[PDB]
Amino acid sequence: MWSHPQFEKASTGREILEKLERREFTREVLKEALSINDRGFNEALFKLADEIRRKYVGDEVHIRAIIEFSNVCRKNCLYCGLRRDNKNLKRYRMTPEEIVERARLAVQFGAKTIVLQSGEDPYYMPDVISDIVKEIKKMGVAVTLSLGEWPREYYEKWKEAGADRYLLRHETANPVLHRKLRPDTSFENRLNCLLTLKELGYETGAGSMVGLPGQTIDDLVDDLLFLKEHDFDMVGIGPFIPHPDTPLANEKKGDFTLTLKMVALTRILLPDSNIPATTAMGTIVPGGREITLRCGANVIIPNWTPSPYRQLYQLYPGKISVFEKDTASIPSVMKMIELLGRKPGRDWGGRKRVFE
Numbered sequence: 100m101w102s103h104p105q106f107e108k109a110s111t112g113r114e115i116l117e118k119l120e121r122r123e124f125t126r127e128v129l130k131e132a133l134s135i136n137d138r139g140f141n142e143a144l145f146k147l148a149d150e151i152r153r154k155y156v157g158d159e160v161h162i163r164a165i166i167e168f169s170n171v172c173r174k175n176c177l178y179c180g181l182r183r184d185n186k187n188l189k190r191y192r193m194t195p196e197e198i199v200e201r202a203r204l205a206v207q208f209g210a211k212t213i214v215l216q217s218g219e220d221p222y223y224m225p226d227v228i229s230d231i232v233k234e235i236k237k238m239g240v241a242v243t244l245s246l247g248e249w250p251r252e253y254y255e256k257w258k259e260a261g262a263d264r265y266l267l268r269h270e271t272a273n274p275v276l277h278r279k280l281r282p283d284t285s286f287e288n289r290l291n292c293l294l295t296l297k298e299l300g301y302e303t304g305a306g307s308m309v310g311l312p313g314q315t316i317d318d319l320v321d322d323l324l325f326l327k328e329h330d331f332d333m334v335g336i337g338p339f340i341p342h343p344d345t346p347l348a349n350e351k352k353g354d355f356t357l358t359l360k361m362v363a364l365t366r367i368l369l370p371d372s373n374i375p376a377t378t379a380m381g382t383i384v385p386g387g388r389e390i391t392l393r394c395g396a397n398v399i400i401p402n403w404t405p406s407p408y409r410q411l412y413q414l415y416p417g418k419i420s421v422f423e424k425d426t427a428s429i430p431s432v433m434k435m436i437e438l439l440g441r442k443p444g445r446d447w448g449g450r451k452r453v454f455e
């Protein structure tokens with residue numbers, strides 16, 4: 100019987116980069132790009148993604164100020180510190196006046212988008228959110244909501260109240276793992292929400308965690324292909340960070356390099372999308388968001404949740420630095436952007452269609 104030797108690894112890695120540069124995004128090519136463990140291949144992939152980012156989204160790093168206004172959640176996701184079964188966390192809700200005034204302060208510090216994010220907290224839904232959104236829209240900025248899965252009628256009310264964008268990370272495109280990790284719901288529910296949000300005219304954001312328990316490289320390829328299929332306006336990617344007060348406490352943490360390759364491939368697949376350097380990337384490696392901004396990301400989301408709430412929004416350990424004042428994050432990220440040679444966004448930074 101005759102032999103079947105593999106190709107040399109250097110020549111394989113060079114061929115994969117060429118396929119990516121020519122935009123031949125077959126499953127095998129995406130799988131091999133995520134499986135190669137070579138510093139020189141990875142650096143060339145990050146440079147390709149940085150090139151694409153320069154050409155189709157430019158040098159602005161858009162600043163979105165987030166206010167995490169309630170840590171109450173009716174769901175029980177196995178990865179999240181806010182899951183309802185975690186009784187070892189003090190819960191909070193901000194008043195609408197606190198939220199609106201905190202948003203006004205971020206606008207005065209120069210944020211051109213306000214992100215409102217919460218647990219799935221029924222107290223607010225739908226009418227308290229609508230009132231808050233109407234007040235923030237009078238400040239002349241964009242509004243992004245990130246409130247979870249709700250009925251079409253609620254999404255429609257919030258669009259009429261003026262909301263521009265909605266971030267609903269898809270978490271994992273594998274439906275069997277999705278149901279195991281999110282026992283209240285399903286990938287079909289999550290996708291139907293994203294489809295409803297797009298049909299209503301929101302700019303929509305999806306995106307997965309990298310390194311979840313049970314997730315394989317083939318699953319990460321399916322996440323990339325799902326993102327490509329829908330041409331999402333925004334994509335939020337970060338590593339899974341185990342939380343000690345959850346069932347996943349003892350599982351492996353998501354790997355930084357693999358997550359950065361996911362960000363880089365997402366930029367290559369979706370050249371004009373908005374891609375944050377997420378909080379979780381800054382949690383796992385010192386300077387992690389700065390690195391990610393050189394590997395295809397073009398958005399940063401400074402934490403604008405005020406004390407004493409901000410330290411209770413404990414999605415994962417290490418998320419909040421207790422050492423600086425709760426107005427430090429917007430000037431800090433502006434300094435970071437300056438030192439990278441980039442500039443803050445000039446307008447609201449909505450996704451544009453310039454590729455093709």
Ligand SMILES: Nc1ncnc2c1ncn2[C@@H]1O[C@H](CSCC[C@H](N)C(=O)O)[C@@H](O)[C@H]1O
Nearest residue numbers: 178179217218219246247268338339340415
């Ligand atoms: N342990 C963990 N590690 C990393 N990211 C996590 C995490 N737990 C939650 N997250 C991320 O935090 C995001 C926001 S949770 C708040 C918004 C809303 N309840 C929703 O679920 O969409 C989730 O989309 C998820 O990707």
Ligand code: SF4
Nearest residue numbers: 172174176179182218
């Ligand atoms: S990920 Fe969102 S829905 Fe799930 S428990 Fe956390 S806050 Fe609730």
Ligand SMILES: [C-]#N
Nearest residue numbers: 375377378400
């Ligand atoms: C999220 N950053």
Ligand SMILES: [Cl-]
Nearest residue numbers: 163212243264
């Ligand atoms: Cl946004």
Ligand SMILES: [Cl-]
Nearest residue numbers: 400401402428
């Ligand atoms: Cl921050």
Ligand SMILES: [Fe+2]
Nearest residue numbers: 335377378400
């Ligand atoms: Fe985020």
